[PDB]
Ligand binder design. Structure first.
Ligand SMILES: [Zn+2]
Ligand SMILES: [Zn+2]
Lengths: 188, 185, 189
């Protein structure tokens, strides 16, 4: 599953290269292991390979990671106790398993230190990835911006990565860069 | 009056046995001294507080005391509690005939008390002495606790803790074991 | 111009006298420099207003937000540390006089690490509105207008407001520690 493992690390590095997530920000991972393995039921092997490759890069930058479980658990997420506390998350009571929750949330639950399940992130993630068309947008804060990365797939699953950036505001006379602001000042 | 305190201490004792509230959590007390004895009693308020407060405070649990409905159930908390929990302070001073004896006894005993609008449903547990209701202050899901002490004085005691919502459909599981058993398959 | 900074300085001192804001509190400034002048904006008039109002607030550890005009949806300039302390949402834009006003632009130029934020989520404890631009949307309940001796800044009318807790309770309630102790006598032996 090395390529799953390898492709995972790559995307995480590419992502952070394009979106240098600061310490304390929050990252959300959603994905389907059945999709990662294609048409050949979930896979724990694949699950651990994805995490194996994806998590270190983010953890090294002190970025908090959340792993969304599937719809049978309402998409509650596996997070470290400290992340729930740092982000004011509401804990919900359930324990994931491949058949009820999925292999990726289950493997995350086993690999974390003091995992807890949370109802949602209250849409506070700053960036994240969707592996396999499971959807992760509900977890991201405005404004989500899809990121085209060179790594287009993790196994056979289509990879969708998104960063977030602030809303663009103000009317026809407004500007959006410091450079343009300075020109309006010279003109003034 | 010492018996009211003794029932209060046994209640607090049983309550924390079943729900060992951690440092930093919030307990809400609501109650009517009139029901413990329609005239409030500061004496009865002192006994209930002496019985309830020490075991909570020694655990680092924050305490809120709900005033009656004439002050719209605004509660008494230490200024630090209002700060840790992002509570909104309102302007009023309680007295037994408008606030009730217990909010009054708390306001006088607290180091730096403020009246707050509500706790924004943040409490992890509490007690209702006399059926005055405290549910609106508790975070989901409130689980009432059976304690041997069913009354304080002549007032019924309702005690409750809180716990996370149970979620997931028919295949979901709820204990680490059940999970393992599921992995082994 | 010095006349404008002096009226700003008097406004400030008097305001903080009537409402001694604590460190960590939040003050909101809104205004039209064109109104101060008595048309187009002026960075000089902005400069005079900020030099008069900001040193006394900052020395008390009060966080300051400066409201841009409606072309920028009244987003506000605040230090990044303030956006963070008050859980504010950063918005993407750069004010300039013609779009945002001179006051907000001067704040942005002067702050150390400025960011624009969408609103203050009505968390401000007090502020000033110079010229009738409105700042009430930024104040937490209950806003209380203060009458300062300083009524204008330049030609702009000055409106200053503090905030205080909602007064609650029915007919039997009391509102001072004094009234409370008296009510307790009457109950106690
Ligand atoms: Zn100057
Ligand atoms: Zn200066």
């Amino acid at each position: 599953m090395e390529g799953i493992r390898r492709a995972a690390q790559r995307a995480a590095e590419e992502f952070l290269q394009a979106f240098p997530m600061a310490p304390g920000s929050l990252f959300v991972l959603g994905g389907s292991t059945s999709e990662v393995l294609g048409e050949r039921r979930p896979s724990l092997e694949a699950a651990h390979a994805v995490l194996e490759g994806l998590l270190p890069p983010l953890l090294e930058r002190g970025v908090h990671v959340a792993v969304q479980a599937c719809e049978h658990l309402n998409r509650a997420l596996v997070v470290e106790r400290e992340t729930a506390r740092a982000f004011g998350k509401e804990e919900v009571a359930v324990f994931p398993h491949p058949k009820a929750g999925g292999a990726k949330a289950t493997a995350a639950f086993l690999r974390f230190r003091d995992p807890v399940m949370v109802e949602s992130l209250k849409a506070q993630a700053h960036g994240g990835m969707d592996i396999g068309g499971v959807l992760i947008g509900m977890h991201l804060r405005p404004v989500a911006v899809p990121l085209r990365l060179s790594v287009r797939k993790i196994g056979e699953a289509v990879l969708l990565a998104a960063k977030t950036r602030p809303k663009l505001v103000g009317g026809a006379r407004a500007v959006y860069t410091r450079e343009e602001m300075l020109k309006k000042l010279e003109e003034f």
